Amino acid sequence: EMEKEFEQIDKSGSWAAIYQDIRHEASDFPCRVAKLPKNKNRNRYRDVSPFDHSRIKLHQEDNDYINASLIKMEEAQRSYILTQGPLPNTCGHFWEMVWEQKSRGVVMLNRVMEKGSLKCAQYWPQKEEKEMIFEDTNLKLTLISEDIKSYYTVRQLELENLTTQETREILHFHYTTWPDAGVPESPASFLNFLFKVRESGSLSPEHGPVVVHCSAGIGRSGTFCLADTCLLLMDKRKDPSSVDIKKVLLEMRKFRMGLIQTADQLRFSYLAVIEGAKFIMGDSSVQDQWKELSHE
């Protein structure tokens, strides 16, 4: 069971060894398209690449490469696209992928600048009157509205295929107070944020897969998807005990490398799922307690 395992591993201070065992058993698949010379400048970190079998292909005949992986969770019935923070030259690719994949939401888990370094291009417009046009992919992006809370921001964007003039509303969910180092002490603000994304319909199956990223798209993005899928699985059977987090994480790692970057993120994932279980279980009032403790 999950809380029993958590305490056992905690009282024993073996989180590093648990996490390292996951590192060792994790799938290894080729990344040959990612490594081709013509794609060097499409990759933010040379040590973070999409496997060839799960990579998102741009619908273009020149170069279909973007550093993005489709994580398809069969049992949980939820799909996610995990990607790096766009580079100055891949912002058009990024929105092209969002369009072609029919995604409704983008989850951003980083700030544009962290630890005094640029982690991510400014890939969405900050002012309604200053829309962005990506000439390569022929897409137009307009800030429609913005809802700033204390630790996250929700933006409504309109994405227009400048070729076909059809338009889509994209929801941008921007979690802004992940700490520069370490993980959050309590998972309540994290869970309140995940449920905000869930309530927007961005995760539901009539839309394309949600796009999730931080700078590399494996650590914080890994934590987000793992907690969501774990909670989803406990829901479908209401069997808290039947969900094995580590086996869910290893299943996810079949689709993109490196998901969950530190042992403390693994531990936090446990925290989030355990606490999130209090909602799944029938205690609907626990969601509003997280909204209080989060200070949104």
Decide: 154 and 147 in contact? Cβ < 8 Å: yes
Ligand-binding site membership of 147 (annotated): no
User: Angle at CA 163, nearest 5°, toward 160 and 169?
Assistant: 15
Catalytic residue check, 214: yes
Ligand-binding site membership of 13 (annotated): no
Domains of the chain, CATH where assigned: 1-296 (3.90.190.10)
Å resolution of this model?
A: 2.2
3-state secondary structure 216-244: CCCCHHHHHHHHHHHHHHHHHHCCHHHCC
Please indicate the experimental technique that yielded this structure: X-ray
Give the active site residue among 31, 214, 225, 230: 214
Ligand-binding site membership of 235 (annotated): no
Ligand-binding site membership of 26 (annotated): no
β-strand partners of 157: 143, 170
Tokens of 56: 């998102």
Tokens of 204: 């539901």
Instruction: List, in sequence order, the alpha helices (H) in the chain.
Output: 2-11, 15-25, 32-35, 91-100, 188-199, 220-237, 245-252, 263-280, 286-294
Q: For the chain, how many residues are written?
A: 296
Ligand-binding site membership of 47 (annotated): no
